[PDB]
């Protein structure tokens, strides 16, 4: 026959091959390898996106690592001794514009830690799913929860109500709760507890939220900046033509003065040169590349676009460079020079903190994580089971129990490594479409994630305009659920619309879910009350 056929027949009839039920599922070794490769190509964008988004959270370090800064910018702090010269002690404002150099350095170290954490969590989840559940599903930090954890639960550079360690503890406890409810078969009841329009429209709302993030400045390609009158207008002006905003006090004559302690923003307001940012146009080029790759059914569309934009940004002395001519840029380029590096997690590994359990925001974030994971994992797992033809008449696909337990265990392990919840990727369908049927597909994806390590220097040098279009197009892909909402029935359209729109506007998944569920409950109060009276016999 051939070497490939000999390998396939040897593996299929071996003890390892029969452990994965290769022969019973009509695929032995090379179909599984090809399916795993296709799935990894489809999901590889996460290696960059998850790390960047979680690094934007600020990590585990606080003002404690902000180096004191001299009164005058031109003198390095060690030389901050002289007449009328003093060292300014850092405060909370050191974490934001202008970011303290020490905090930025710690954020870069956290980005390396989170790259390794994403790779390790995805690897472990894939291995657990392949061995325990024996399904061709790949696990990794979900895109829906990455942004919620980074920009809402924790906030940009720790500006949220919950600290990064407390958010990790919330994710850990959420994974434990999910594992518990799945183990006792009580998950389906929680799934039903969520209103149908809200459940369906949460995906579209999260897609809009991710797209909005991809159109911010510190997150994506720009194109959406601050506006005094409208709060959002056309950004994409060059970084030099952007200024920060500070709170002020108005009066009845026209005087305006700064407010002490005000939280100054990033360079989000454009003063001139709109639609002239070279980084924005490079991001648009990457968007076009990914869009054509998706249209042409090319596996790895997002990774190809990210690679193009990042490689164009790897040049040192351009306006779209990822390594500006500064100390931080010099350090980033020095780390990037080493193509391969075995980075060890030093900050985000085992950074759980249960101080904020009593806080209400902790439980808001915990419940949002729990329900996003429940709904997403249920829908994705059953859709992949349908794709692979494992769903029987009753709706059970054999390894569903262990699939959900594996997902929950992966969430807990990811929390222990310092990353947002890890879920089963819909990109796994690609591997299913290529013939993957057993757990060897997940093991292949895990091996590719192993290979993803030793490349943190390349993965840590991906700019915002590279993250960018991947986020916008992920938001595009998640909008297809709007067709499942009955927009003629207002009792279902209003909750769905609220769920979709509050998520980007309030910029929070939890607020979108709360508003949608509240509107659904309010709009059905009349129907529920009438039905209760009827069931009691008052009405006919």
Ligand X SMILES: *[C@@H]1O[C@H](CO)[C@@H](O[C@@H]2O[C@H](CO)[C@@H](O)[C@H](O)[C@H]2NC(C)=O)[C@H](O)[C@H]1NC(C)=O
**What's the CA gap between 267 and 244, in Å, rounded?**
5
- Output 77 or 238, the one with its CB closest to ligand X: 77
As a whole number of angstroms, the distance between CA 520 and CA 514 comes to: 10
Question: What is the DSSP pairing of strand 139-141 with strand 257-258?
Answer: unpaired
Closest CA to 48 of 473, 459, 471, 465: 459
In whole angstroms, how close is the CB of 37 to ligand H35 at the nearest point?
A: 17
Looking at beta carbons only, is 416 or 422 nearer to ligand H35?
422
Residue 255 touches ligand X, criterion: CB under 6 A:
yes
83: contact with ligand X by CB under 6 A = no
Which one among 4, 16, 88, 534 touches ligand X, defined by CB under 6 A?
Answer: 88
Question: Restricting to residues 149-208, which ones interact with ligand X according to CB under 6 A?
Answer: none
Sequence-separated (6 or more) residues with CB below 8 Å from residue 537:
none
Two structure tokens written together for 423: 């879920």
Binding mask 477-516 for ligand H35 (x = CB under 6 A): -x--------------------------------------
The residue count for the chain: 540
Interacting span for ligand H35 (CB under 6 A) from 73-81, 142-150, 246-254, 451-459: 142-150
Question: Residue 102 CB: number of other CB atoms within 10 A?
Answer: 18
The residue range among 182-190, 271-279, 324-332, 419-427 that interacts with ligand H35, by the rule CB under 6 A, is 419-427
**Parallel, antiparallel, or unpaired for β 422-424 and 69-70?**
unpaired
HSE on the CB side for 62, CA within 13 Å? 10
Using the minimum distance from each CB to ligand X, give the nearer residue, 92 or 285.
Answer: 92
Nearer to ligand X, 1 or 254 (CB): 254
**Minimum CB distance to ligand X smaller for 74 or for 536:** 74
Between CA 225 and CA 244 the distance in angstroms is 11
In angstroms, the CA 239 to CA 267 distance is: 8
| 232 contact, one of a second copy, ligand H35, ligand X, none, CB 5-8 Å limit per kind | a second copy
Q: Assess 376 for contact with ligand H35 (CB under 6 A).
A: yes
Q: Does 67 bind ligand X (CB under 6 A)?
A: no
| Residue 423 interacts with ligand H35 (CB under 6 A): yes or no | yes
Distance CA 147, CA 135 (A): 28
Interaction of residue 144 with ligand H35, rule CB under 6 A: yes
Stretch that binds ligand X, among 252-260, 288-296, 317-325, 499-507 (CB under 6 A): 252-260
Angstrom distance (rounded) from CA 209 to CA 478: 10
214 contacts ligand H35 (rule: CB under 6 A): no
> Which residue lies nearer to ligand H35 by CB, 142 or 463?
142
Work out the number of other CB atoms within 10 angstroms of the CB of residue 458: 22
Residue 226 is classified by DSSP as: B
Look at the block and give the residue holding tokens 């003890």: 15
Binding partner of residue 427 among ligand X, a second copy, ligand H35, none, CB under 5 to 8 Å per kind?
ligand H35
| 211 scored as a contact of a second copy (CB under 8 A) | yes
Distance CA 197, CA 496 (A): 5
* From candidates 267, 341, 427, 434, binder to ligand H35 by CB under 6 A: 427
Of 191, 157, 513, the residue nearest 382 (C-alpha): 191
- Which of 31, 163, 216, 380 contacts a second copy by CB under 8 A? 216
| 3, 184, 252, 342: residue in contact with a second copy (rule CB under 8 A) | 252
Residue among 119, 235, 345, 372 that touches ligand H35 (CB under 6 A): 372
Residues 6+ apart with CB under 8 A from 144: 203, 206, 210, 372, 376, 423, 478, 509
Task: Check residue 431 for interaction with ligand H35 (CB under 6 A).
Answer: no
Q: Is 153 in the site for ligand H35 (CB under 6 A)?
A: no
Distance, in Å, from the CA atom of 361 to the CA atom of 219, rounded to the nearest integer, reads 24
Residue of 257, 297, 317, 483 interacting with ligand X (CB under 6 A)? 257
Provide the terminal-to-terminal Cα distance of the chain, rounded to the nearest Å: 76
Evaluated on CA atoms 392, 395, 396, 402, the torsion sign reads positive
Give the range of 103-111, 222-230, 348-356, 422-430 binding ligand H35 by CB under 6 A: 422-430
Q: Rule CB under 6 A: which residues touch ligand H35?
A: 142-145, 203, 206, 372, 376, 380, 423, 425-427, 478
């Amino acid at each position: 026959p051939k070497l490939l056929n000999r390998l396939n027949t040897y593996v299929g009839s071996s003890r390892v091959g029969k452990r994965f039920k290769l022969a019973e599922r009509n695929s032995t070794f090379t179909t599984e390898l090809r399916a795993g490769t296709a799935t990894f190509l489809t999901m590889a964008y996460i290696l960059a996106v998850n790390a960047s988004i979680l690094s934007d959270s600020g990590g585990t370090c606080s003002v404690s690592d902000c180096i004191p800064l001299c009164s005058n910018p031109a003198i390095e702090p060690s030389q901050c001794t002289g007449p009328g010269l003093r060292l300014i002690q850092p405060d909370v404002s050191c974490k934001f514009n202008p970011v303290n150099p020490g905090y930025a350095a710690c954020v870069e170290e956290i980005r390396k830690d989170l790259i390794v954490a994403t790779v390790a969590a995805s690897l472990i989840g894939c291995v657990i799913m392949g061995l325990m559940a024996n399904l061709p599903l790949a696990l990794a930090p979900g895109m829906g929860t990455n942004a919620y954890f980074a920009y809402t639960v924790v906030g940009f550079h720790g500006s949220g109500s919950i600290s990064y360690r407390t958010a990790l503890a919330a994710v850990f406890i959420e994974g434990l709760i999910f594992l518990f409810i799945s183990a006792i078969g009580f998950r389906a009841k929680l799934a039903k507890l969520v209103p149908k329009p809200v459940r369906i429209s949460s995906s579209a709302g999260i897609g809009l939220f991710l797209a909005f993030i991809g159109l911010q400045n510190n997150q994506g390609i720009g194109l959406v900046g601050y506006s005094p009158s409208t709060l959002v207008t056309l950004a994409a002006c060059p970084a030099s033509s952007r200024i920060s905003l500070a709170p002020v006090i108005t009066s009845a004559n026209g005087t305006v003065s700064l407010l002490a302690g005000g939280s100054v923003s990033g360079d989000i307001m454009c003063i001139h040169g709109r639609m002239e940012s070279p980084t924005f146009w490079l991001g648009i080029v990457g968007f076009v590349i990914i869009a054509y790759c998706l249209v042409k059914n090319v596996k790895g569309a997002m990774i190809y676009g990210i690679v193009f934009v990042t490689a164009v940004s790897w040049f040192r002395n351009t306006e779209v460079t990822a390594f500006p001519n500064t100390s931080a840029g010099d350090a980033a380029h020095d780390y990037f020079k080493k193509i391969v590096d075995v980075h060890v997690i030093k900050h985000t590994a085992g950074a759980l903190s249960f101080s904020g359990i009593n806080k209400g925001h902790f439980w808001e974030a915990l419940v949002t994580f729990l329900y996003v994971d429940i709904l997403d994992t249920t829908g994705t797992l059953y859709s992949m089971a349908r794709f692979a033809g494992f769903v029987d008449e009753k709706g059970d696909f054999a390894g569903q129990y262990f699939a959900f337990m594996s997902d929950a265990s992966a969430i807990v392990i990811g929390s222990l490594l310092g990353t947002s919840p890890v879920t089963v990727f819909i990109e796994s369908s690609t591997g299913i479409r290529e013939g993957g049927r057993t757990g060897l597909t997940a093991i292949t994806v895990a091996v590719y994630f192993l290979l993803a390590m030793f490349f943190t220097p390349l993965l840590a040098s991906i700019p915002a305009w590279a993250v960018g279009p991947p986020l916008i197009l992920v938001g595009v892909m998640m909008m297809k659920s709007v067709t499942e909402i009955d927009w003629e029935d207002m009792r279902e359209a209003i909750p769905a619309f609220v769920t979709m729109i509050l998520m980007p506007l309030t910029y929070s998944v939890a607020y979108g879910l709360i508003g949608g569920i509240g509107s659904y409950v309010v709009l059905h109060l009349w129907d529920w009350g009438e039905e209760g009276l009827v069931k009691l016999g008052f009405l006919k």
